[PDB]
Amino acid sequence: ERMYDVTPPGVVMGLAWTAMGGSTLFVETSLRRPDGSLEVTGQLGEVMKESARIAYTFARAFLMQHAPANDYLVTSHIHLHVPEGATPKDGPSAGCTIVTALLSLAMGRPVRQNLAMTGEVSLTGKILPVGGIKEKTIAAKRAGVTCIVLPAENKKDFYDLAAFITEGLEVHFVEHYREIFDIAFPDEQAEALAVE
Ligand SMILES: *[B]([O])([O])[C]([C][C][C]C1=[C][C]=[C][C]=[C]1)[N]C(=O)[C]([C][C][C])[N]C(=O)C1=[C]N=[C][C]=N1
């Protein structure tokens, strides 16, 4: 009951909440050409369009720090679209979902399947709380998500949910974005038998 059953690179699942309940929105990223830029579509609002420019600044900065060999974001002409097409959307609960879509694209490696997230991001990566966590959690469950990432400040809003709703959700309560990265992209933080 969702738009994507398998998120490729550049596609992350987010959570949006309306007065009619929850819903699952998918952030998407792609290339336009083979200084680097950014483009946005999906009837986004003046408040969220700032969350894109913040997540874009942070994702570039995150690349600069952890994998400095990766120039993908500082040079490429990127395009972000959040379907469905004509629905209006405004709000920073898409912040982290965007960062992950940008990194996922800039790495060429998809995100954990069956993962939804929501949370406002700051410029330094602090993950700030968002609203209607009850309806975002419910729409993740009605839509088939097994791993949810909430802002850690939104812990009560999640545990106000009945016993049957939250059971069976791998939920992570995160304060910086580095905690979302280690969950969205697990293989990065995974022990291995270094051979040779
Ligand atoms: B968030 O709660 O701010 C959310 C972000 C929606 C955009 C998005 C979500 C997930 C992935 C990618 C993009 N904003 C909302 O849900 C908006 C409307 C979205 C269509 N609703 C509100 O901001 C709001 C305000 N007051 C009461 C109820 N809703």
Side-chain angles (χ1 to χ4, degrees), residues 1-19 21-32 34 36-141 143-188 190 192-195:
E1 195 168 310
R2 66 186 167 176
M3 182 170 343
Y4 279 103
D5 297 68
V6 166
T7 86
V11 163
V12 188
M13 186 177 210
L15 299 174
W17 88 295
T18 166
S23 36
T24 52
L25 294 194
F26 282 94
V27 172
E28 308 193 77
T29 50
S30 163
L31 258 191
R32 319 195 337 266
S37 99
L38 177 75
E39 190 165 7
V40 171
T41 69
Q43 289 286 36
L44 310 216
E46 163 60 345
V47 156
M48 187 192 329
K49 278 194 280 157
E50 284 175 12
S51 265
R53 282 306 323 200
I54 291 170
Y56 188 58
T57 282
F58 179 73
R60 281 163 151 175
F62 195 101
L63 261 62
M64 290 182 173
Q65 289 204 54
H66 292 47
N70 204 320
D71 55 70
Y72 191 107
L73 296 177
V74 80
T75 72
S76 304
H77 304 156
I78 315 172
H79 184 163
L80 179 157
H81 174 56
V82 182
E84 33 274 28
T87 304
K89 308 160 196 71
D90 194 45
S93 58
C96 52
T97 320
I98 297 164
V99 184
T100 298
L102 297 177
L103 306 190
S104 177
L105 180 75
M107 286 180 301
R109 301 265 184 284
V111 296
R112 171 189 172 164
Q113 302 307 331
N114 295 292
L115 175 95
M117 74 183 68
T118 200
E120 171 190 335
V121 75
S122 78
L123 202 48
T124 85
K126 285 217 54 165
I127 289 298
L128 303 194
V130 290
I133 294 273
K134 278 151 267 205
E135 302 87 354
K136 292 183 175 148
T137 292
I138 290 170
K141 203 103 162 293
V145 180
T146 73
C147 192
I148 191 170
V149 189
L150 308 182
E153 289 206 35
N154 279 128
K155 212 189 179 187
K156 174 198 123 77
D157 282 17
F158 175 88
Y159 292 115
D160 288 348
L161 266 191
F164 63 99
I165 298 178
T166 62
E167 83 171 328
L169 282 206
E170 190 171 298
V171 64
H172 302 136
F173 289 107
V174 294
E175 305 152 327
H176 310 267
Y177 179 98
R178 66 221 192 193
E179 323 190 20
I180 301 178
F181 191 103
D182 290 315
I183 287 159
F185 309 101
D187 210 5
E188 299 278 286
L193 318 194
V195 146

